Design a protein around this ligand. Structure first.
Ligand SMILES: Cc1ccc2c(=O)c3cccc(CC(=O)O)c3oc2c1C
Ligand SMILES: Cc1ccc2c(=O)c3cccc(CC(=O)O)c3oc2c1C
Lengths: 182, 182
């Protein structure tokens, strides 16, 4: 299935690269946050998985209570055939009742952008119902891969969410804070 | 199918990013090769697609007549949700009868590493015959995507190859030189 390929490629071609040294980067970042009240960043990579159509270009614009703060130190990759690539990860503040309630490394899972594009291009043969079915299966498959994987290690957390078509009351910051608070 | 997901994700998540400015990077690189005898780099990204099992960790070690020379100038990416990533591409010399016969940007298609890993991990449910079938379909599917794609533009060339199980006479440098010479 499409989802099975996307889940394995995202693990092999991203998570496996980025997770092993994530903790050390976070540790380095948190040297500037010895005052806990200034908001040290939490330890995990939180991966957002909106099942519904589209993924926002700008994560912080998804929710007024999620605000971009800055970046972790960069990760240089020189293995698995790739030469000198540099990856970045972003740190966001989560607000609740006007005050910072959490700080974390957040990002959308990129293969959802591929599922979205396939649904737009008719040569992909991919209906909207197919897109949703594969998005769901991508999430399940990736969950299962990570349960086994050596590189996590309490390193990564998937946050999948789907909103009712007729309501816009879902709060992404609240959803992430739920995961943070445990 | 697995291949369909891999082909679309490699287009959306790599080729679409790297191809639009490739020409300009090559032009910049070739400022140091105004003497053609020193070997200016050819214009396309040549993507190697070995269908057989495994992809070499080190492209230049695949063939004594392919030698790594150096890198293009880097490509900074800050769009499609990714913040400040830096990509690189490698320039190789191709030799024939002891002398340089071509110079090009070469790399293996990364989703083949994913197909290889899926064949190694039993939770993937993926036999060796499945792996080959999907590798072939990945190549066909990607070919078809690129035929349409706006970002190439005589920018990219796929070089797929499969060797007989009982013979080791295939020369990768000769195969690439064939494509270069047209
Ligand atoms: C911008 C973009 C869009 C889609 C993918 C993708 O499907 C995809 C699937 C597997 C692995 C990757 C690599 C990554 O997320 O760095 C992928 O990257 C994508 C990227 C970077
Ligand atoms: C090291 C490695 C391994 C596998 C993939 C991959 O399957 C894959 C599939 C689609 C898109 C990408 C992104 C890329 O090649 O930069 C992919 O990247 C991979 C990388 C970088």
């Amino acid at each position: 299935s499409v989802a099975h390929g996307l889940a394995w490629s995202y693990y092999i071609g991203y998570l496996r690269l980025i997770l092993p040294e994530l903790q050390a980067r976070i540790r380095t970042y948190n040297q500037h946050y010895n005052n806990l009240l200034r908001g040290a960043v939490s330890q995990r990579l939180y991966i957002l998985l909106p099942l519904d159509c589209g993924v926002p270009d700008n994560l912080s614009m998804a929710d007024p209570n999620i605000r971009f703060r800055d970046m972790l130190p960069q990760q240089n990759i020189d293995r698995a055939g790739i030469k000198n690539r540099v990856y970045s990860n972003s740190v966001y503040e989560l607000l609740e009742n006007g005050q910072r309630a959490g700080t974390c490394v957040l990002e959308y899972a990129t293969p959802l952008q591929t599922l979205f594009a396939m649904s737009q291009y008719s040569q992909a043969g991919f209906s909207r119902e197919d897109r949703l079915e594969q998005a769901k299966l991508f999430c399940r498959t990736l969950e299962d891969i990570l349960a086994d994987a050596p590189e996590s290690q309490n390193n990564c957390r998937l946050i999948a969410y789907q909103e009712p078509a007729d309501d816009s009351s879902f709060s992404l910051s609240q959803e992430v804070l739920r995961h943070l608070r445990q």
